[PDB]
């Protein structure tokens, strides 16, 4: 039943303006992310995240999710996954030098 | 985009 079409972190194909408008919300907590379809990439996805600093405000970091033509995914040349979900779990409990461990998803 | 380092 768990289909990537209705994932808790899968909105689908959205514009870039609305994307930054969803993570750049004073109500969104620092750590909110969202996986959508590759708008500028090809046959790939894009995991975005939200961050907050005590100097300027909250910014939005975009982490394009790569995809191995063999059948895998990875946003860095060191860890690989067999499903966009696995990549969201590892980065959800281990920033691994990311902007912030995933804590919430986009509503 | 950013890079994991």
Swiss-Prot record, chain A:
Subcellular location field: Cell membrane; Mitochondrion inner membrane; Nucleus; Cytoplasm, Cytoskeleton
PTM comment, free text: The phosphorylated form is termed pp60c-src.
Coiled coil regions, renumbered to chain: none
UniProt domain SH2: residue ranges: 9-106
Tissue: Expressed ubiquitously. Expressed in the skin (at protein level). Platelets, neurons and osteoclasts express 5-fold to 200-fold higher levels than most other tissues.
Phosphotyrosine: residues bearing it: 45
Domain notes: The SH2 and SH3 domains are important for the intramolecular and intermolecular interactions that regulate catalytic activity, localization, and substrate recruitment.
Stated role: Non-receptor protein tyrosine kinase which is activated following engagement of many different classes of cellular receptors including immune response receptors, integrins and other adhesion receptors, receptor protein tyrosine kinases, G protein-coupled receptors as well as cytokine receptors. Participates in signaling pathways that control a diverse spectrum of biological activities including gene transcription, immune response, cell adhesion, cell cycle progression, apoptosis, migration, and transformation.
Further comment: May be involved in blister formation in Pemphigus vulgaris, phosphorylated-SRC is abundant at blister sites but not in normally adherent tissue, which corresponds with loss and disruption of CDH1 in cells adjacent to blisters. Phosphorylated SRC is increasingly abundant at pre-lesional sites of blister formation and occurs prior to changes in abundance of CDH1 and DSG3.
Quaternary assembly: Part of a complex comprised of PTPRA, BCAR1, BCAR3 (via SH2 domain) and SRC; the formation of the complex is dependent on integrin mediated-tyrosine phosphorylation of PTPRA. Interacts with DDEF1/ASAP1; via the SH3 domain. Interacts with CCPG1. Identified in a complex containing FGFR4, NCAM1, CDH2, PLCG1, FRS2, SRC, SHC1, GAP43 and CTTN. Interacts with ERBB2, STAT1 and PNN. Interacts with DDR1, DDR2 and DAB2. Interacts with CDCP1, TGFB1I1 and TOM1L2. Interacts with the cytoplasmic domain of MUC1, phosphorylates it and increases binding of MUC1 with beta-catenin. (Microbial infection) Interacts with HEV ORF3 protein; via the SH3 domain.
Protein family: Belongs to the protein kinase superfamily. Tyr protein kinase family. SRC subfamily.
Disease: SRC kinase activity has been shown to be increased in several tumor tissues and tumor cell lines such as colon carcinoma cells. Thrombocytopenia 6: A form of thrombocytopenia, a hematologic disorder defined by a decrease in the number of platelets in circulating blood, resulting in the potential for increased bleeding and decreased ability for clotting. THC6 is an autosomal dominant form. Affected individuals may also have bone abnormalities and an increased risk for myelofibrosis.
Name this protein carries in UniProt: Proto-oncogene tyrosine-protein kinase Src
Source organism of this protein record: Homo sapiens (Human)
Encoding gene per record: SRC
Full-protein positions shown: 144 to 249 of 536
């Amino acid at each position: 039943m768990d289909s990537i079409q209705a994932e808790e972190w899968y909105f689908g194909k959205i514009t870039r303006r609305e994307s930054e408008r969803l993570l750049l919300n004073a109500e969104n907590p620092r750590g909110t992310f969202l996986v959508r379809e590759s708008e500028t990439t090809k046959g790939a996805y894009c995991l975005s995240v939200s961050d907050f600093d005590n100097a300027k405000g909250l910014n939005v970091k975009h982490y394009k999710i790569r995809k191995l033509d063999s059948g895998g995914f990875y946003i860095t040349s060191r860890t690989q996954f067999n499903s966009l979900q696995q990549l969201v779990a590892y980065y959800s409990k281990h920033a691994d030098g990311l902007c912030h461990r995933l804590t919430t998803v986009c509503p | 985009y950013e890079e994991i380092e």
